[PDB]
Amino acid sequence: RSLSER
Amino acid sequence: RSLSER
Amino acid sequence: AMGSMERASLIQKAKLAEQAERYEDMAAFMKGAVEKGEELSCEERNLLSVAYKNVVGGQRAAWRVLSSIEQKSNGPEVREYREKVETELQGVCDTVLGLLDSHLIKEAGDAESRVFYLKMKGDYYRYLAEVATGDKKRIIDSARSAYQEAMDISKKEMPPTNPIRLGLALNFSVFHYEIANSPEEAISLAKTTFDEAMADLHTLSEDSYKDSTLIMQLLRDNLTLWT
Amino acid sequence: AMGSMERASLIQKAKLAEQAERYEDMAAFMKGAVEKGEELSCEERNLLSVAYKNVVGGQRAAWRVLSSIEQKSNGPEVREYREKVETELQGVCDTVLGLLDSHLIKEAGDAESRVFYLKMKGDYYRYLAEVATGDKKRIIDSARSAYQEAMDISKKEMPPTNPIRLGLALNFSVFHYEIANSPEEAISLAKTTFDEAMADLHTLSEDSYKDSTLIMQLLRDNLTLWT
Ligand SMILES: C[C@H]1c2ccccc2O[C@@H]1C(=O)NCc1sc(C(=N)N)cc1-c1ccccc1
Ligand SMILES: C[C@H]1c2ccccc2O[C@@H]1C(=O)NCc1sc(C(=N)N)cc1-c1ccccc1
Ligand SMILES: [Cl-]
Ligand SMILES: [Cl-]
Ligand SMILES: [Mg+2]
Ligand SMILES: [Mg+2]
Ligand SMILES: [Mg+2]
Ligand SMILES: [Mg+2]
């Protein structure tokens, strides 16, 4: 799955 | 700290 | 239930809850702080976002586990329980969207605050879209509109290395790839964002450079997965 | 609120909640199952224990963080929030103890079930003792009595390698070291338990051997820390 902002 | 049961 | 607590006490307790990893409590304290009606500072906006990101993150992880189990089974229990978790997730998203609409966005005049809240609006519509079926179309359009307005302001008012601008572009690219079935748009946005930030790193202090390159790494990681 | 759901459905949903890491839900489903009034199977006892261990474990970790912050500060916020978490922890412990007293322990005739529930009673009084101040003395005696009755039954009815017997002895040793200020008793119990189990490993299948040696490693780790 794509990485979103931390 | 002491380890208790898992 | 937080209406009787002082604003400053709610913020202090949100910071304690964060240290204790009590994210439901943290979100309740920050909802209480927002409902005092004053604008939030940068630190306070971050406390709000961290709290709800962690709450909804746990719900999303659980929904994905249950949805996978349900798909392989295709009694009513798996569906019923997935539906329960889905309803709770939708309720948290509706709570956040309600805080943004009443009245954080309309009172945010500065670009830093308005972009932050519009990005949040996109993110919480995106989480609704992950579980929607319709209805899905309307939710996707609401997410896209919020992210696009945030992008327009950020490109006019912030440098390409600004961490809020970078995190907005990152999340909008994820929206395009995972939600909107627009993988080429996702790749184009991530590439342009990365390259424009690279060319602006020379303007940054050592500390700002670390902030910006941290988010650029996530853009790079996605581009590697997507190509 | 679980009174309208079938027992079998509550158990199935507890298993799903475990996979989804939704431990509060898991505990609610298992409380509902206990309240149907039928005895629990070995698998079901384990679901009950896993659920509440994870719920109270998060509360204990948070209380320790907050108590540490409070001690270093010595406004009312840290104390108030530590007290809130403490009250919630005590309420969970009281819920578990109430299930054991109404009526799991009295209906448990077999050694495997009675020892399991008496160990749980010791554990949840131990968690109450961690936060008590008195009152503390009475709680400590309740924990000790439950653990000792469980030990007496386990030594008469189970082999030294039985995992329930081993986990009971492990937790009673932790009680002695961390709660009762009896470190020599803790070391003696852990050593005797370890040695008696070692001498019984030859009787076990490969799978049982793995179960028993796993818990023996925890006894060994504590002995290393304590000596
Ligand atoms: C270094 C910052 C950074 C860079 C890139 C990506 C993420 C990120 O995050 C860090 C950070 O520090 N972001 C602001 C936060 S995060 C936070 C919290 N309590 N979780 C409190 C504050 C804050 C803001 C202004 C003034 C004081 C504190
Ligand atoms: C291998 C077992 C073991 C050995 C040593 C220490 C811990 C431990 O734990 C394992 C285990 O398997 N313990 C029983 C469990 S744990 C569980 C869960 N759902 N968390 C379900 C069941 C179970 C019991 C009987 C019949 C079917 C399932
Ligand atoms: Cl359900
Ligand atoms: Cl509080
Ligand atoms: Mg006031
Ligand atoms: Mg304003
Ligand atoms: Mg029935
Ligand atoms: Mg019986």
PDB file of all heavy atoms in Angstrom, chain D residues 163-192:
ATOM      1  N   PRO D 163       1.688 -25.799  31.257  1.00  0.00           N
ATOM      2  CA  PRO D 163       1.857 -24.360  31.036  1.00  0.00           C
ATOM      3  C   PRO D 163       1.062 -23.462  31.971  1.00  0.00           C
ATOM      4  O   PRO D 163       1.525 -22.363  32.285  1.00  0.00           O
ATOM      5  CB  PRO D 163       1.436 -24.187  29.565  1.00  0.00           C
ATOM      6  CG  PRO D 163       1.780 -25.517  28.940  1.00  0.00           C
ATOM      7  CD  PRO D 163       1.443 -26.529  29.988  1.00  0.00           C
ATOM      8  N   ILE D 164      -0.138 -23.883  32.382  1.00  0.00           N
ATOM      9  CA  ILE D 164      -0.900 -23.075  33.330  1.00  0.00           C
ATOM     10  C   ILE D 164      -0.171 -23.032  34.670  1.00  0.00           C
ATOM     11  O   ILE D 164      -0.056 -21.980  35.299  1.00  0.00           O
ATOM     12  CB  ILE D 164      -2.329 -23.609  33.496  1.00  0.00           C
ATOM     13  CG1 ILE D 164      -3.064 -23.703  32.162  1.00  0.00           C
ATOM     14  CG2 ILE D 164      -3.106 -22.690  34.432  1.00  0.00           C
ATOM     15  CD1 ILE D 164      -4.267 -24.645  32.226  1.00  0.00           C
ATOM     16  N   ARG D 165       0.322 -24.185  35.128  1.00  0.00           N
ATOM     17  CA  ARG D 165       1.087 -24.233  36.370  1.00  0.00           C
ATOM     18  C   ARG D 165       2.337 -23.379  36.282  1.00  0.00           C
ATOM     19  O   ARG D 165       2.649 -22.614  37.204  1.00  0.00           O
ATOM     20  CB  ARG D 165       1.461 -25.687  36.682  1.00  0.00           C
ATOM     21  CG  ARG D 165       2.276 -25.849  37.958  1.00  0.00           C
ATOM     22  CD  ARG D 165       2.405 -27.296  38.434  1.00  0.00           C
ATOM     23  NE  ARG D 165       3.476 -27.412  39.417  1.00  0.00           N
ATOM     24  CZ  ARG D 165       3.850 -28.544  39.996  1.00  0.00           C
ATOM     25  NH1 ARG D 165       3.228 -29.685  39.707  1.00  0.00           N
ATOM     26  NH2 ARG D 165       4.861 -28.528  40.852  1.00  0.00           N
ATOM     27  N   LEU D 166       3.048 -23.453  35.155  1.00  0.00           N
ATOM     28  CA  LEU D 166       4.241 -22.638  34.970  1.00  0.00           C
ATOM     29  C   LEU D 166       3.915 -21.142  34.955  1.00  0.00           C
ATOM     30  O   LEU D 166       4.628 -20.329  35.562  1.00  0.00           O
ATOM     31  CB  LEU D 166       4.952 -23.018  33.672  1.00  0.00           C
ATOM     32  CG  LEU D 166       5.620 -24.384  33.703  1.00  0.00           C
ATOM     33  CD1 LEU D 166       6.202 -24.723  32.332  1.00  0.00           C
ATOM     34  CD2 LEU D 166       6.730 -24.422  34.743  1.00  0.00           C
ATOM     35  N   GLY D 167       2.878 -20.748  34.207  1.00  0.00           N
ATOM     36  CA  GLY D 167       2.533 -19.336  34.161  1.00  0.00           C
ATOM     37  C   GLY D 167       2.028 -18.802  35.488  1.00  0.00           C
ATOM     38  O   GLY D 167       2.297 -17.648  35.834  1.00  0.00           O
ATOM     39  N   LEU D 168       1.322 -19.639  36.259  1.00  0.00           N
ATOM     40  CA  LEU D 168       0.940 -19.277  37.622  1.00  0.00           C
ATOM     41  C   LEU D 168       2.163 -19.005  38.482  1.00  0.00           C
ATOM     42  O   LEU D 168       2.249 -17.988  39.181  1.00  0.00           O
ATOM     43  CB  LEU D 168       0.116 -20.410  38.230  1.00  0.00           C
ATOM     44  CG  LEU D 168      -0.092 -20.394  39.734  1.00  0.00           C
ATOM     45  CD1 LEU D 168      -0.856 -19.144  40.165  1.00  0.00           C
ATOM     46  CD2 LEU D 168      -0.831 -21.642  40.135  1.00  0.00           C
ATOM     47  N   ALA D 169       3.121 -19.934  38.481  1.00  0.00           N
ATOM     48  CA  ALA D 169       4.304 -19.761  39.314  1.00  0.00           C
ATOM     49  C   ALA D 169       5.102 -18.536  38.897  1.00  0.00           C
ATOM     50  O   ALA D 169       5.621 -17.800  39.741  1.00  0.00           O
ATOM     51  CB  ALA D 169       5.165 -21.029  39.212  1.00  0.00           C
ATOM     52  N   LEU D 170       5.214 -18.313  37.585  1.00  0.00           N
ATOM     53  CA  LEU D 170       5.881 -17.115  37.084  1.00  0.00           C
ATOM     54  C   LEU D 170       5.223 -15.860  37.645  1.00  0.00           C
ATOM     55  O   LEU D 170       5.898 -14.980  38.202  1.00  0.00           O
ATOM     56  CB  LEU D 170       5.844 -17.129  35.562  1.00  0.00           C
ATOM     57  CG  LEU D 170       6.337 -15.875  34.866  1.00  0.00           C
ATOM     58  CD1 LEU D 170       7.816 -15.659  35.110  1.00  0.00           C
ATOM     59  CD2 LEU D 170       6.065 -15.956  33.377  1.00  0.00           C
ATOM     60  N   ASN D 171       3.891 -15.763  37.513  1.00  0.00           N
ATOM     61  CA  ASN D 171       3.224 -14.536  37.942  1.00  0.00           C
ATOM     62  C   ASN D 171       3.246 -14.370  39.458  1.00  0.00           C
ATOM     63  O   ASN D 171       3.354 -13.250  39.954  1.00  0.00           O
ATOM     64  CB  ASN D 171       1.804 -14.470  37.385  1.00  0.00           C
ATOM     65  CG  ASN D 171       1.773 -14.153  35.917  1.00  0.00           C
ATOM     66  OD1 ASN D 171       2.812 -14.073  35.268  1.00  0.00           O
ATOM     67  ND2 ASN D 171       0.576 -13.955  35.384  1.00  0.00           N
ATOM     68  N   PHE D 172       3.143 -15.473  40.222  1.00  0.00           N
ATOM     69  CA  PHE D 172       3.248 -15.388  41.679  1.00  0.00           C
ATOM     70  C   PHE D 172       4.644 -14.913  42.072  1.00  0.00           C
ATOM     71  O   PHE D 172       4.802 -14.128  43.016  1.00  0.00           O
ATOM     72  CB  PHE D 172       2.905 -16.764  42.280  1.00  0.00           C
ATOM     73  CG  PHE D 172       2.562 -16.780  43.750  1.00  0.00           C
ATOM     74  CD1 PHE D 172       2.253 -15.637  44.456  1.00  0.00           C
ATOM     75  CD2 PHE D 172       2.519 -17.997  44.421  1.00  0.00           C
ATOM     76  CE1 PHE D 172       1.926 -15.717  45.807  1.00  0.00           C
ATOM     77  CE2 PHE D 172       2.159 -18.084  45.766  1.00  0.00           C
ATOM     78  CZ  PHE D 172       1.856 -16.949  46.459  1.00  0.00           C
ATOM     79  N   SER D 173       5.670 -15.356  41.337  1.00  0.00           N
ATOM     80  CA  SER D 173       7.021 -14.882  41.642  1.00  0.00           C
ATOM     81  C   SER D 173       7.150 -13.387  41.389  1.00  0.00           C
ATOM     82  O   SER D 173       7.814 -12.671  42.150  1.00  0.00           O
ATOM     83  CB  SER D 173       8.085 -15.690  40.889  1.00  0.00           C
ATOM     84  OG  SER D 173       8.129 -15.394  39.511  1.00  0.00           O
ATOM     85  N   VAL D 174       6.533 -12.890  40.305  1.00  0.00           N
ATOM     86  CA  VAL D 174       6.519 -11.450  40.041  1.00  0.00           C
ATOM     87  C   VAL D 174       5.798 -10.703  41.150  1.00  0.00           C
ATOM     88  O   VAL D 174       6.275  -9.668  41.624  1.00  0.00           O
ATOM     89  CB  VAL D 174       5.917 -11.171  38.652  1.00  0.00           C
ATOM     90  CG1 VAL D 174       5.667  -9.671  38.453  1.00  0.00           C
ATOM     91  CG2 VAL D 174       6.863 -11.695  37.581  1.00  0.00           C
ATOM     92  N   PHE D 175       4.649 -11.231  41.599  1.00  0.00           N
ATOM     93  CA  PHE D 175       3.964 -10.673  42.752  1.00  0.00           C
ATOM     94  C   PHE D 175       4.907 -10.552  43.942  1.00  0.00           C
ATOM     95  O   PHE D 175       4.995  -9.501  44.570  1.00  0.00           O
ATOM     96  CB  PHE D 175       2.770 -11.549  43.102  1.00  0.00           C
ATOM     97  CG  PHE D 175       2.148 -11.248  44.445  1.00  0.00           C
ATOM     98  CD1 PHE D 175       1.226 -10.197  44.607  1.00  0.00           C
ATOM     99  CD2 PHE D 175       2.498 -11.991  45.551  1.00  0.00           C
ATOM    100  CE1 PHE D 175       0.676  -9.946  45.856  1.00  0.00           C
ATOM    101  CE2 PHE D 175       1.934 -11.738  46.794  1.00  0.00           C
ATOM    102  CZ  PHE D 175       1.025 -10.698  46.931  1.00  0.00           C
ATOM    103  N   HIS D 176       5.623 -11.635  44.271  1.00  0.00           N
ATOM    104  CA  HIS D 176       6.511 -11.564  45.426  1.00  0.00           C
ATOM    105  C   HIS D 176       7.581 -10.489  45.243  1.00  0.00           C
ATOM    106  O   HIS D 176       7.919  -9.761  46.186  1.00  0.00           O
ATOM    107  CB  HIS D 176       7.199 -12.921  45.647  1.00  0.00           C
ATOM    108  CG  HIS D 176       6.308 -14.012  46.153  1.00  0.00           C
ATOM    109  ND1 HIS D 176       5.506 -13.876  47.264  1.00  0.00           N
ATOM    110  CD2 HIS D 176       6.116 -15.279  45.706  1.00  0.00           C
ATOM    111  CE1 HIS D 176       4.861 -15.010  47.485  1.00  0.00           C
ATOM    112  NE2 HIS D 176       5.214 -15.880  46.553  1.00  0.00           N
ATOM    113  N   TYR D 177       8.164 -10.403  44.046  1.00  0.00           N
ATOM    114  CA  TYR D 177       9.293  -9.492  43.845  1.00  0.00           C
ATOM    115  C   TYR D 177       8.835  -8.038  43.764  1.00  0.00           C
ATOM    116  O   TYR D 177       9.457  -7.145  44.371  1.00  0.00           O
ATOM    117  CB  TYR D 177      10.059  -9.866  42.574  1.00  0.00           C
ATOM    118  CG  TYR D 177      11.374  -9.146  42.443  1.00  0.00           C
ATOM    119  CD1 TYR D 177      12.533  -9.721  42.941  1.00  0.00           C
ATOM    120  CD2 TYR D 177      11.451  -7.899  41.862  1.00  0.00           C
ATOM    121  CE1 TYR D 177      13.749  -9.078  42.843  1.00  0.00           C
ATOM    122  CE2 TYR D 177      12.676  -7.237  41.759  1.00  0.00           C
ATOM    123  CZ  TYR D 177      13.809  -7.841  42.257  1.00  0.00           C
ATOM    124  OH  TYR D 177      15.026  -7.203  42.157  1.00  0.00           O
ATOM    125  N   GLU D 178       7.781  -7.763  42.997  1.00  0.00           N
ATOM    126  CA  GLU D 178       7.413  -6.386  42.662  1.00  0.00           C
ATOM    127  C   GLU D 178       6.370  -5.790  43.596  1.00  0.00           C
ATOM    128  O   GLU D 178       6.301  -4.557  43.726  1.00  0.00           O
ATOM    129  CB  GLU D 178       6.850  -6.324  41.235  1.00  0.00           C
ATOM    130  CG  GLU D 178       7.821  -6.702  40.146  1.00  0.00           C
ATOM    131  CD  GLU D 178       8.904  -5.647  39.920  1.00  0.00           C
ATOM    132  OE1 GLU D 178       8.788  -4.543  40.495  1.00  0.00           O
ATOM    133  OE2 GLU D 178       9.864  -5.924  39.162  1.00  0.00           O
ATOM    134  N   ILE D 179       5.535  -6.599  44.229  1.00  0.00           N
ATOM    135  CA  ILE D 179       4.399  -6.123  45.015  1.00  0.00           C
ATOM    136  C   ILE D 179       4.620  -6.322  46.499  1.00  0.00           C
ATOM    137  O   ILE D 179       4.413  -5.405  47.302  1.00  0.00           O
ATOM    138  CB  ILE D 179       3.081  -6.812  44.576  1.00  0.00           C
ATOM    139  CG1 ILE D 179       2.845  -6.663  43.079  1.00  0.00           C
ATOM    140  CG2 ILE D 179       1.902  -6.307  45.420  1.00  0.00           C
ATOM    141  CD1 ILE D 179       2.691  -5.253  42.587  1.00  0.00           C
ATOM    142  N   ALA D 180       5.006  -7.539  46.902  1.00  0.00           N
ATOM    143  CA  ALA D 180       5.014  -7.951  48.291  1.00  0.00           C
ATOM    144  C   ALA D 180       6.345  -7.695  48.973  1.00  0.00           C
ATOM    145  O   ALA D 180       6.487  -8.049  50.142  1.00  0.00           O
ATOM    146  CB  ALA D 180       4.656  -9.444  48.405  1.00  0.00           C
ATOM    147  N   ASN D 181       7.311  -7.125  48.262  1.00  0.00           N
ATOM    148  CA  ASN D 181       8.643  -6.852  48.804  1.00  0.00           C
ATOM    149  C   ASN D 181       9.272  -8.111  49.405  1.00  0.00           C
ATOM    150  O   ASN D 181       9.899  -8.080  50.471  1.00  0.00           O
ATOM    151  CB  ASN D 181       8.622  -5.698  49.809  1.00  0.00           C
ATOM    152  CG  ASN D 181       9.985  -5.043  49.961  1.00  0.00           C
ATOM    153  OD1 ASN D 181      10.739  -4.916  48.991  1.00  0.00           O
ATOM    154  ND2 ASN D 181      10.318  -4.647  51.183  1.00  0.00           N
ATOM    155  N   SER D 182       9.110  -9.232  48.698  1.00  0.00           N
ATOM    156  CA  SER D 182       9.620 -10.539  49.119  1.00  0.00           C
ATOM    157  C   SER D 182      10.517 -11.094  48.021  1.00  0.00           C
ATOM    158  O   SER D 182      10.194 -12.129  47.414  1.00  0.00           O
ATOM    159  CB  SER D 182       8.466 -11.493  49.397  1.00  0.00           C
ATOM    160  OG  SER D 182       7.640 -11.053  50.465  1.00  0.00           O
ATOM    161  N   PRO D 183      11.623 -10.421  47.710  1.00  0.00           N
ATOM    162  CA  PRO D 183      12.466 -10.870  46.596  1.00  0.00           C
ATOM    163  C   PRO D 183      13.055 -12.251  46.798  1.00  0.00           C
ATOM    164  O   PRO D 183      13.252 -12.976  45.815  1.00  0.00           O
ATOM    165  CB  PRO D 183      13.556  -9.794  46.505  1.00  0.00           C
ATOM    166  CG  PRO D 183      13.563  -9.147  47.846  1.00  0.00           C
ATOM    167  CD  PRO D 183      12.156  -9.200  48.349  1.00  0.00           C
ATOM    168  N   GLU D 184      13.374 -12.637  48.026  1.00  0.00           N
ATOM    169  CA  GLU D 184      13.926 -13.977  48.213  1.00  0.00           C
ATOM    170  C   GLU D 184      12.879 -15.036  47.936  1.00  0.00           C
ATOM    171  O   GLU D 184      13.192 -16.084  47.351  1.00  0.00           O
ATOM    172  CB  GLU D 184      14.557 -14.108  49.594  1.00  0.00           C
ATOM    173  CG  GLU D 184      15.905 -13.377  49.612  1.00  0.00           C
ATOM    174  CD  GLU D 184      16.485 -13.164  50.978  1.00  0.00           C
ATOM    175  OE1 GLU D 184      15.730 -13.206  51.972  1.00  0.00           O
ATOM    176  OE2 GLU D 184      17.717 -12.938  51.048  1.00  0.00           O
ATOM    177  N   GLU D 185      11.623 -14.792  48.318  1.00  0.00           N
ATOM    178  CA  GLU D 185      10.548 -15.714  47.987  1.00  0.00           C
ATOM    179  C   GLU D 185      10.383 -15.823  46.475  1.00  0.00           C
ATOM    180  O   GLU D 185      10.151 -16.929  45.949  1.00  0.00           O
ATOM    181  CB  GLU D 185       9.232 -15.264  48.632  1.00  0.00           C
ATOM    182  CG  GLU D 185       8.076 -16.236  48.500  1.00  0.00           C
ATOM    183  CD  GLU D 185       8.202 -17.478  49.382  1.00  0.00           C
ATOM    184  OE1 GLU D 185       8.960 -17.421  50.372  1.00  0.00           O
ATOM    185  OE2 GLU D 185       7.527 -18.486  49.090  1.00  0.00           O
ATOM    186  N   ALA D 186      10.470 -14.697  45.763  1.00  0.00           N
ATOM    187  CA  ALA D 186      10.372 -14.684  44.308  1.00  0.00           C
ATOM    188  C   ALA D 186      11.449 -15.548  43.672  1.00  0.00           C
ATOM    189  O   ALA D 186      11.168 -16.351  42.777  1.00  0.00           O
ATOM    190  CB  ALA D 186      10.496 -13.257  43.799  1.00  0.00           C
ATOM    191  N   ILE D 187      12.693 -15.386  44.134  1.00  0.00           N
ATOM    192  CA  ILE D 187      13.815 -16.135  43.574  1.00  0.00           C
ATOM    193  C   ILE D 187      13.682 -17.616  43.891  1.00  0.00           C
ATOM    194  O   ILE D 187      13.860 -18.468  43.007  1.00  0.00           O
ATOM    195  CB  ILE D 187      15.127 -15.539  44.108  1.00  0.00           C
ATOM    196  CG1 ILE D 187      15.370 -14.162  43.526  1.00  0.00           C
ATOM    197  CG2 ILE D 187      16.297 -16.479  43.755  1.00  0.00           C
ATOM    198  CD1 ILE D 187      16.393 -13.320  44.303  1.00  0.00           C
ATOM    199  N   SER D 188      13.297 -17.957  45.116  1.00  0.00           N
ATOM    200  CA  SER D 188      13.134 -19.359  45.492  1.00  0.00           C
ATOM    201  C   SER D 188      12.055 -20.024  44.647  1.00  0.00           C
ATOM    202  O   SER D 188      12.236 -21.146  44.144  1.00  0.00           O
ATOM    203  CB  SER D 188      12.798 -19.493  46.979  1.00  0.00           C
ATOM    204  OG  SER D 188      12.730 -20.863  47.394  1.00  0.00           O
ATOM    205  N   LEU D 189      10.912 -19.353  44.478  1.00  0.00           N
ATOM    206  CA  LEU D 189       9.821 -19.947  43.705  1.00  0.00           C
ATOM    207  C   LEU D 189      10.217 -20.122  42.250  1.00  0.00           C
ATOM    208  O   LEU D 189       9.954 -21.171  41.646  1.00  0.00           O
ATOM    209  CB  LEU D 189       8.557 -19.078  43.819  1.00  0.00           C
ATOM    210  CG  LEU D 189       7.358 -19.558  43.002  1.00  0.00           C
ATOM    211  CD1 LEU D 189       6.970 -20.957  43.347  1.00  0.00           C
ATOM    212  CD2 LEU D 189       6.197 -18.561  43.245  1.00  0.00           C
ATOM    213  N   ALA D 190      10.853 -19.124  41.662  1.00  0.00           N
ATOM    214  CA  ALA D 190      11.231 -19.238  40.261  1.00  0.00           C
ATOM    215  C   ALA D 190      12.252 -20.351  40.055  1.00  0.00           C
ATOM    216  O   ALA D 190      12.173 -21.094  39.064  1.00  0.00           O
ATOM    217  CB  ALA D 190      11.768 -17.896  39.761  1.00  0.00           C
ATOM    218  N   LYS D 191      13.201 -20.497  40.988  1.00  0.00           N
ATOM    219  CA  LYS D 191      14.237 -21.520  40.861  1.00  0.00           C
ATOM    220  C   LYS D 191      13.645 -22.916  41.006  1.00  0.00           C
ATOM    221  O   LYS D 191      13.922 -23.809  40.192  1.00  0.00           O
ATOM    222  CB  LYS D 191      15.314 -21.315  41.924  1.00  0.00           C
ATOM    223  CG  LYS D 191      16.355 -20.244  41.690  1.00  0.00           C
ATOM    224  CD  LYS D 191      17.403 -20.313  42.830  1.00  0.00           C
ATOM    225  CE  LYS D 191      18.505 -19.250  42.762  1.00  0.00           C
ATOM    226  NZ  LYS D 191      18.738 -18.674  41.407  1.00  0.00           N
ATOM    227  N   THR D 192      12.817 -23.133  42.029  1.00  0.00           N
ATOM    228  CA  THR D 192      12.230 -24.449  42.225  1.00  0.00           C
ATOM    229  C   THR D 192      11.318 -24.813  41.064  1.00  0.00           C
ATOM    230  O   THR D 192      11.287 -25.963  40.619  1.00  0.00           O
ATOM    231  CB  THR D 192      11.484 -24.542  43.548  1.00  0.00           C
ATOM    232  OG1 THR D 192      10.541 -23.486  43.669  1.00  0.00           O
ATOM    233  CG2 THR D 192      12.448 -24.467  44.679  1.00  0.00           C
TER     234      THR D 192
END
